[PDB]
Amino acid sequence: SMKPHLAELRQRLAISVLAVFVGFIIAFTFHNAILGWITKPLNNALIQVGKIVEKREMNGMITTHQVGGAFFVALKVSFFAGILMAMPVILWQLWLFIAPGLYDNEKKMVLPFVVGGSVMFLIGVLFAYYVVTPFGFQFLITFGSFLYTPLINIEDYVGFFTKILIGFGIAFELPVVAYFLALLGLITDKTLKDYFKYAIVIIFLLAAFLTPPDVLTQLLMAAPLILLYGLSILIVHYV
Amino acid sequence: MFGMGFSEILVIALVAILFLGPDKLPEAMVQIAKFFNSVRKTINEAKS
Amino acid sequence: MFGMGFSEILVIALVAILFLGPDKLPEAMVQIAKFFNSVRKTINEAKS
């Protein structure tokens, strides 16, 4: 009875996997360019911090602490880029599978929501790379400048950078999702100050999910989520 | 548990007691149990 | 789960749907359930 639908899932997953593989090939063909794009803020921050240190006194750089670390980082970056470029095909197949499983009243919501979410995710990633990362990296490296030497390794930096980019994309999508919902009489200010009690618990559960078992990481991930919820309250208040 | 520790469980419990409080804790746990029982009902229906 | 993540579960499920497919997925799941029930029967027999 699941047969007429398992064939479609198989075929669409095959197309999505093929798209991801082609994207991985195209990305690994240009892994140097993507790696330079990723590492440009780090190099700029290190050069600026070196300038500050030389000014004060009158080194640190990007390293690799694993033998296969550079190759693994290149593969990871190429895989992430392949997923990102295959996301059009992936979401096309996913919607085509879920479309004849949704009533004729949820498509009209899901399409503009998905489109606006994608645009705001792109805007957030660009904002993080160009306006946040240059200042944040400089502040973080200058923080441990008079005590430690910044021998920054690429393996952890890649994960840190991707996490920042994805988090900023989501932090740009949530306050636009709030506006979109508030347009259609769905959530109002009162509706947002009455489910706050469960909202903070859900926020902390999400922080526990997306961070290592460390408590401090959970709190440091829950605080920006709380700020985004507070901003959402104002947005739905002035909607 | 997929990168999740016991201390995190304790922190979420602390938040739950603090913000929900005397009431809205029993109600929240009751509704979470009801939702989980409904999920189990769905998986039982699938396994039929 | 001993160095195992959820995304890995998803990759294994994708492989299972891709390679087994329409048939041999229900059969494989049925046989895995049968083997687990047999293991439980063995541990029940041990506890006697």
């Binding site: 009875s1 699941m2 499983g101 | 998986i43 | -």
Partner: peptide, 19 residues
């Protein structure tokens, strides 16, 4: 079996794999 039941049950087993 219809598609909506498929999505329901798939989401259910996905949740069960995260408990």
């Amino acid at each position: 079996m219809q598609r909506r039941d498929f999505l329901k049950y798939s989401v259910a087993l996905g949740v069960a794999s995260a408990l």
